[PDB]
């Protein structure tokens, strides 16, 4: 085929076919001339190797290369491999009615809807708009309608708002590791260029908003639309298929807001009053007369399912907090008050959603999950939950733990100089007394971090769980482990060589203090090993998944 | 194993599309095999409804209006 | 201090004094290419070495020879800017003097008949620009340096990864610079095997017999002889005591006294030592002891003459009895034991089939050239040309050095080829390592890995082209045309041009220059790559080559590497790292002589570095130089430990010695996790230059170095006074101190204005200087993209609050204020180039015209009479930029449209509209139009007016520079005329030019006046011919591609404002995407009503442990808090005494900081200028690992009257009520990355399809479809979405008839598909049938 600049582009099969024809015609010529048989045998060998290179180039002998020193693509290479017919063109394809954009968060969205840019939707839904422009008489011809959509008249946006109305779109994030990597959403036309993804589905997609892109696909037929609505819609996808656990589950900001709301302070403002219900708790919190953590006595009416499907009420005064009473207002009816009368971490909220699903079903659960998201976002905003440098509280006895382990390592070093121990048990003793000192620093840090709110109850001091922000993020399951608070406020501990063997002097520093040049270098030793594992194991996991799919 | 079990299927199309396409097509050609398109990959290759899901009814009445 | 640096002084918090200045950052590229192209009087480097490698060329005769005299690089035809405009390589012609010397037929001397000596043109060499780039086909490219395995011999093993028994099998590998590889190795049965070019292994004694060694000579090479000097009886045997080390006691030893050790007791050291106390030489041995030993010689009889016993046969009672009838005095025997002297060479002589040199050469031939019957001459020449030919094998100077150094030889010079001794020593050292007397090499050691840079890779490719021309020159000299030809008739410049053209344009290491910002450019130029020709492949590079080796310290950054499939394969040079004369990375260290750390700096390589104990740079040391401590932390051997202060030999020269230039710019890097620091270093060089540059409030102090060592700024070459400043040029009147005699003394700096980078960003230079301002040498005169007063400014200083805001910063999202968008803080200019190419077609030439069919007068509103858009035209997507029509024919009207045109009489167009339009969604301004017309094509009115404008501009620029330069000359003349023989009022009485007619009394005065007159005449006649050179290069035709008649390049400038979806990031790996742009009254605000610019999530901080973004925030609030104070003093119009006092307080703050800023030295005008530059926040330097401590941050927060907690009380903009906890508010340096959502958003309903398979095309440039790959198909199969899947497979991609039916059905409101067969399945069926295979659909 002629290229744009008058040059031609060809397949390697034309080179291979031409070679077969040329050697075949020369063989016919030689058999006509009655050549010496050393020449005819050579031409027969050449015709054989030309036909072999045409069928499978590189099996027998060296691959024939043409004019690049790059081997020619034979007929067998057309159909085999990751770039053959099967895997590149038959088992997966490039499709029409498909777009792609960066995803952002919409925290206002409902679980079944996405935000779709108007510029993307105007292109993805273009024959639908042409049809509804010709149908409504706004265009006399599909070319008149095409010019209307090019000019983007004010009426094609009304036509677009009615063609997308009940029409789902499939949103896909690569890698599609499981079936929740494609989910269907009802589009809400937005003004950006970025797709607005619901927060609660991000864990299903393994998506964060740091530059991820997602593909949009438009189901065209009525069957595809009803499968998007009935099989693939995100409100059908709240349970995992791998394990029956909820996969549309609160995280990060939502669980921090719901945890901060359901916690209790000792002498919080408005402590010890008696409330007529959750609406009074919300009135007192919003008017500034009671704190979200004020432990309080609220008259709570909770409904339970009897032996039958009936929902019978019981009313009682619960010993609760103001924030737990406020959170009770979004809980559906068949659930007990004990589901919120505690500080709600990630596990408790996931179990609350699972309980709602098993007791009440899918329709209360999707409403509950949306309400949970809105409430957790609102009350994480209200909290002002920041991170500062004074939140990484380093234990005051960390320096003496390190000095004591240094004294122990010095006396073991002097024992090795005095021949009491060989190098092996000497090294293992050093490793052991540094792992023990690391555990001591970790325990001291967590003890100084987890309860160090000391608070006055009617004058008397009392210990309570800490409202430290680092600790609240770790304890709620929002972000962070104890193993990472150890690196922020404890010591970073023993590092491994690229060999895998432990360097015998640990990082006695944390990230609040600095690491010096040497500590940082021996930390990069394992940082790069982990990053190279992440980079090289996606191919192995993809190959294993491909083998599993193709066996099953 | 999952490679030798997926290469030993009764369908040469799915096995040839998985891997070792030359071996599969060679043994299927000299054996004169015939692929009845009963799995998901072979109906994906050929652009049909898969025999699972909402295409399960279609394949059922495709096979009971063929066995009758 | 300067004039450019006391404008705005960055407050340094670093405490360690700087002993070594950060070097010129682009020395790698510039030094390497200078070694390539410079005239080397010796033949060591570059083009000279390459020419001497092949010349003199001698034919297969004695008649003539072509020898090389000299070479010369001519002047480039176009300079670098003209090359970028015209799309051509910036290169210099290589003119080489050759001498064709003809010897006559018959003489014992072969003296000359004649010599025909002349200059041949062989190729153009691409020239490197002032900044380390090459312009190749118009685009700037960087030749990345290569980290490859050094040549030499390397001893390795596999550790139990063979033979299922955990046995370690050793090997040796001789790797030349150029030639065949030579591997020795051990099998699981301890036989030595040679293997040439990774082919099948032969026994290693075959290569020993290819060398002329007999089995006896081999056995004396690789063994030592146990002698049995047997007397009349009693089997006397020689013995040295250390030969029975650990010996199994086969017999009790009685000699020079009775038994030391009886049977059943193996020999320990006390026995050897008491036996040598007895000084025993001769021992009586039993007969069963020698049974099994291996004879070391050929013992033949003198009775019959033939062989009794050959060398390397296991001796027995029978054969000793045989030689006893022959009466041999001495019988030698190989000394072998277990674990100290192995039998491997003898056990290998037992396995090989060869018995002489011919058979060995023949076995090597059968291995190298199988199926070819070996003759003696070919078997001899194959081996002699494998490793022992200078033209086929080069173990280069670095390879000879590493070879000799690995074998513990004294000399490091040698031949480039192997010898018998080299191969024997390699085998002996492999045997040593097998016998426990050595250790295997670490091949990832940076003493084993070598840097190969552009000037060496270019030389290698030039030598490749030179041998490609050498074969043809040797072929031409063998012909009898020899007496009438010149040397330029036998030299073909095209192969030599092709070799260097292929290297510079098509290498993997010749990469499109990363031109986002200055940091991108100097990071690209300081990049090392393990990949490339002669390096690794990223697919088969294992885990261990991608690791941070201990030798990387100071030589390669452990942080800056990409995060994807090639991680640890692309590395970045460290700040101080330089390259050896051999190519090995070295790093500088301070010498510690007597415990006193000296300022004497030695550059140590990774081999040398391991010998010494090297203290850290975090090690404190007193005023005299001694360590204040006595137990210092050091690296001795690749380990790190504590040492006494008298054991240390060296010290690190800086705390930033270990990091690259990109990681040196991250403040509080020591508080960031290394993964997030890697991400921050990688994202800093994706930042896009914004409208106004904004210095970092929190920097590290490497900003000036980065901005100046890249060529983006205009830096003062000589000091002077700004004579004329203007947005496009700076004119400096050079100080008399820096002027040469006979010179105008005027420097002119022409600034780059609004050109596009490789990334379509804007490159624009703005002058820093004002009129009449004094400049010193090295001062920044104009800022480049992303520099602010000569400091690298990659982003903007944003007031951040760390708090969750209503889910809008959920999961790395970023909430941005609307004030950030009103104030154009992250608005970036992008410049697109769009080409309309008018070609000859077979139906006729395409025509650039404003007369376009089916296009109204409204769409041709901004086209001129030539059909090209006006400059300055605000265009949007779909607007015609260049109107073009293509001639077509044979419209072949459908009968319905034939009737349609019969009714309404409208003719059909003979041309089709092929115009250049703005891409959709893009809305910019036309800022430039270039028309390139072929010779013979007539220029339209637009090309003529563009060229008239170009000619007036060339004449105007040259007459302006001549006016400036002659004004400088005449100022100098007036100064030298009043310097002696004063005419002070007579000079203004004389006409201006005829001051040159004034004969002056010459002590030295008339000499200077006359060389000034000569300089003026030469300037005038230099302008006069530069004008005609410009005019001829403007009016000349363009060397367009074949078929192309003209090209019109339009340049669009697009201002991109920030919007939801744009990726923003900090320097600490805190990337994110803007989710919302919030109204200002909705943002959180403090007690004073100041809203926050950006709200970031605090939950991204503790799990991604980049704590440095919190500290940078706390310090950024402190820095700004200083400016907020200074600003107030500038609005209250306080005295200079108060401003001077407060700024001195602010600069004196810190715990023993290294910098001293004394403002008493500053004049009041200088203090006020400084205070005006510090009113937007005082900038602060926080050196990596030497930065501000948290107590100093709190002290500076206290100085600015801020809470030392870093956290303030915020209020909700929407409700007015407090957030219940204090919020960390401060200032973070945010960067706008080049992942803009305008470039990412793409959609398609229908479009173009591929040829062979009819599926949609790939990208958004092709308006392509999304890949619904295999895993998405599995996702749909896991749902029951069979109809969704069937329409993905058939009707959306490949079903050709079904997809148009589907379109028509959608348009008719009928959402039903009629799916057929995918077209790629029919392609598959036709391709399986093109094999011999009958694949068929059973249609029953
Ligand atoms: C003169 C200088 C030492 C003084 C010696 C020592 C190491 C030698 C270089 C290396 O061998 C690599 C390479 C081999 C090519 O063959 C020719 C070019 C290269 C760059 C050599 C040039 C020159 O020979 C060097 C610099
Ligand atoms: C101040 C300085 C020395 C006194 C005089 C002498 C030469 C003068 C320049 C040249 O004339 C060229 C050009 C002419 C334009 O018209 C205005 C700009 C230019 C650059 C002039 C600026 C200024 O006037 C110059 C530098
Ligand atoms: Mg991401």
Numbering used by the authors:
A (entry chain D): 253 to 804
B (entry chain D): 1308 to 1375
C (entry chain C): 3 to 1342
Original authors' sentences:
Bacterial RNA polymerase (RNAP) holoenzyme initiates transcription by recognizing the conserved –35 and –10 promoter elements that are optimally separated by a 17-bp spacer. The MerR family of transcriptional regulators activate suboptimal 19–20 bp spacer promoters in response to myriad cellular signals, ranging from heavy metals to drug-like compounds. Here we report one crystal structure of a multidrug-sensing MerR family regulator EcmrR and nine cryo-electron microscopy structures that capture the EcmrR-dependent transcription process from promoter opening to initial transcription to RNA elongation. These structures reveal that EcmrR is a dual ligand-binding factor that reshapes the suboptimal 19-bp spacer DNA to enable optimal promoter recognition, sustains promoter remodeling to stabilize initial transcribing complexes, and finally dissociates from the promoter to reverse DNA remodeling and facilitate the transition to elongation.
To understand how EcmrR facilitates promoter recognition by RNAP and subsequent formation of RPo, we assembled an RNAP-EcmrR complex on a heteroduplex DNA scaffold containing a 19-bp spacer between the –35 and –10 elements in the presence of tetraphenylantimonium (TPSb+), a TPP+ analog that was shown to up-regulate BmrR-mediated transcription. The resulting 2.5 Å cryo-EM structure of EcmrR-RPo contains a 13-nt transcription bubble with template strand (T-strand) DNA positioned at the polymerase catalytic center for RNA synthesis. An EcmrR dimer binds to promoter DNA between the –35 and –10 elements and introduces a 58° kink in the DNA backbone, facilitated by A:T base unpairing at the center of the pseudo-palindromic sequence recognized by the EcmrR dimer. In addition, EcmrR under-twists the 19-bp spacer DNA by 82° relative to an ideal B-form 19-bp DNA and realigns the –35 and –10 elements for recognition by σ4 and σ2 domains, respectively. Although EcmrR and σ70 bind to opposite faces of the promoter, they engage in a direct interaction in the EcmrR-RPo complex. The EcmrR NTD and R157–D160 short helix of σ70 NCR are in close proximity, as evidenced by their connected cryo-EM density, bury 228 Å2 of their surface area and make several favorable interactions through their surface residues. Intriguingly, we observed strong extra density in another hydrophobic pocket (hereinafter designated site II) in the cryo-EM maps of EcmrR-RPo and EcmrR-RPitc-4nt. The density likely corresponds to the tetracyclic sterol head of CHAPSO, which is routinely used in cryo-EM sample preparation of bacterial RNAP complexes to alleviate preferred orientation problems.
